[PDB]
């Protein structure tokens with residue numbers, strides 16, 4: 001990597017500040033999904049093994065007033081982590097103070113402490129989420145000049161717990177998970193093994209305009225599916241019946257088509273129905289046009305075939321957005337057809353970067369065939385737009 005990583009610094013005997021992603025779902029003080037804790041382990045375990053003293057920071061949920069702190073303590077997360085590590089995780093229950101400092105000083109090589117929910121500092125003046133200078137300086141002062149960022153999911157935002165600490169230590173470096181997110185979502189896009197085929201779907205053009213623009217420059221082809229299809233169709237004068245469209249984005253859609261120079265590949269048919277729910281007729285369109293009284297709810301079979309051919313021999317694929325209304329079994333074919341066409345390509349580096357897209361891959365038994373499934377959400381989108389994220393800018397150059 002071009003930034004330093006946790007492997008590039010000497011950790012033995014040192015306090016090591018780590019931003020981890022422990023923002024797990026809770027219900028009544030109970031963790032309902034530990035995936036993010038599991039995903040955090042490799043970096044944590046590495047620091048322990050190297051003889052570092054791990055001081056962990058995370059947010060959980062959002063905290064606007066004092067009453068919001070209830071339910072959002074990391075106490076259950078500290079317990080969960082300790083069980084996964086097979087050792088104690090010290091948990092003073094505070095975000096700052098002399099007791100916290102005393103607890104940190106007492107850590108021996110290989111031990112772990114978890115600071116309370118960083119967004120507890122948001123109650124008085126949004127200090128974490130608005131990156132109060134004094135808070136970042138304070139949290140940095142708890143360490144020995146090393147900060148490891150392993151939370152790609154907030155890398156697109158400037159908070160005290162990422163950029164604040166980074167600004168106040170000598171070495172701010174990437175953890176193992178963030179390193180992989182950068183490798184797949186930034187470097188594999190900027191410097192792709194070609195052919196690079198991007199696939200963008202989902203409900204709407206408006207949340208993907210920046211990514212389409214960037215990937216039109218970086219990719220060899222960009223395949224479009226999902227509801228976003230019908231905004232592109234309407235911009236061309238194609239009838240779309242009752243399909244999901246953003247009339248306020250017709251001009252931008254028209255402009256992306258004009259600039260695409262043949263790189264933007266639309267569906268050539270749809271599976272349509274005469275209602276979104278409670279439909280009594282479902283059928284394939286003959287071609288692009290959707291029937292009056294109907295709406296398009298998946299790409300059609302000619303489109304699946306065309307996209308499969310477009311994917312032949314791809315070496316890099318980035319995918320965000322289902323090709324149809326995947327929640328419904330009648331409209332899963334387009335998405336399944338594209339997933340299978342992606343993962344069969346020899347040597348392909350296949351990368352998923354959307355929430356419903358990852359869920360679909362996992363649910364339908366294809367996820368294990370992809371190279372990387374991103375969980376960075378807004379960060380993933382902003383990085384696919386080609387933006388310089390503050391949490392990454394803040395990292396030390398190798």
Ligand SMILES: Nc1ncnc2c1ncn2[C@@H]1O[C@H](COP(=O)(O)OP(=O)(O)NP(=O)(O)O)[C@@H](O)[C@H]1O
Nearest residue numbers: 202203226227296297321323324325354355356357
């Ligand atoms: N033809 C369609 N008409 C209406 N909705 C559609 C259509 N195709 C897909 N969708 C919806 O698109 C939604 C998912 O879109 P989107 O949220 O953009 O995907 P994602 O994988 O979650 N990407 P992101 O939100 O950036 O992480 C689902 O609710 C689908 O039902």
Ligand SMILES: [Mg+2]
Nearest residue numbers: 001003004005
């Ligand atoms: Mg490096």
Ligand SMILES: [Mg+2]
Nearest residue numbers: 268286287288
């Ligand atoms: Mg046609």
Ligand SMILES: [Mg+2]
Nearest residue numbers: 202354355356
């Ligand atoms: Mg989504």
Ligand SMILES: [Mg+2]
Nearest residue numbers: 002396397398
């Ligand atoms: Mg330089």
